[PDB]
């Protein structure tokens, strides 16, 4: 892709210069994207889960899981075994291409351009971004009729805020 | 008018064999309910967690490091 060759050519050695790694094996990388859609309303209607799986299968290349319940609470009106959410793991080359799509397409479909929200800090290279909405090219008005969103959990091998910021920054992520 | 005073019966646990006995085949050694002592050489566990004596010999008790103990038989 674009980004692997960016690693092999330009992204790595400047980050090596900023911190003086005695081995190239200490280049921090990008592993995962976890995508989640908690619903809550699908307990009332089993037809709510009919569409989110379709949307996530269109945005990703995978059918997501159908997540369990882990609890039994009537104050949140849940038994065990309740189908609530949907996980998408992402590895390999679809990682980089989905981040390419996030750079080129998603972020210029945001109302009220102010920048990517910084404060996902967490110390240990774990930036998550809530997504509220039609921010994707594989989506119709006449198909999507709900106000569902998305979830991004990118987990790295970095150890600071700063190295994680520069991993996300040399690859994109236009923060505020 | 009390709502108490009702009992189980004494089911008579505890070791029924010393160290250094001369023990025939199959006789019980230490009757449990719950694994308090694991078996060792030539000793098996019954359905109700008792202990046997397969080979004829001498009962001796040991350790398993720090926590729990063993029973084993050594023949002549």
């Amino acid at each position: 892709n674009r980004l692997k060759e960016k690693y092999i050519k330009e992204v790595t050695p400047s980050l090596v210069e900023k911190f003086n790694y005695s081995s190239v094996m200490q280049t921090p990388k990008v592993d995962k994207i976890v995508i989640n859609m908690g619903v809550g309303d699908a307990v009332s209607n089993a037809k709510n889960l009919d569409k989110a799986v379709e949307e996530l299968a269109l945005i990703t290349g995978q059918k997501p899981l159908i997540t369990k319940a882990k609890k039994s609470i009537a104050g949140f009106r849940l038994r065990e075994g309740m189908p609530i959410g949907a996980k998408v793991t992402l590895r390999g080359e679809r990682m980089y291409e989905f981040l390419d799509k996030l750079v080129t397409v998603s972020l210029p479909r945001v109302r009220d351009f102010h920048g990517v929200s910084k404060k996902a800090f967490d110390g240990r290279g774990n930036y998550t971004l809530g997504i509220k909405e039609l921010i994707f090219p594989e989506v119709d008005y006449d198909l999507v009729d709900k106000v569902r969103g998305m979830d991004i959990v990118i987990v790295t091998t970095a150890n600071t805020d700063e190295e994680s910021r520069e991993l996300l920054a040399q690859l994109g992520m236009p923060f505020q | 008018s009390t709502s108490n005073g009702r009992d189980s019966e004494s089911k008579r646990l505890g070791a029924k064999s010393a160290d250094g006995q001369t023990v025939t085949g199959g006789s019980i050694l230490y009757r449990q309910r719950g694994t308090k002592i694991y078996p060792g050489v030539n000793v098996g566990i019954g359905g109700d967690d008792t202990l046997f004596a397969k080979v004829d010999g001498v009962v001796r008790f040991e350790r398993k490091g720090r926590d729990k103990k063993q029973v084993s038989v050594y023949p002549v």
Partner: protein
Amino acid sequence: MKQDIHPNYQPVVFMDSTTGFKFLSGSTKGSSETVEWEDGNTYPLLRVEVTSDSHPFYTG
């Protein structure tokens, strides 16, 4: 990849009102436009020409 359980997606090229960067993949289809050997030999019909170049984080 476990079989029979995945949607369809292909090397779908991008086109754009600013220069049409011909690089990436996608899933949607349509009319055969850029079956071009240096790039994805498939549909380029990711053609919402919202640029990520006319917006003043990339633009200034």
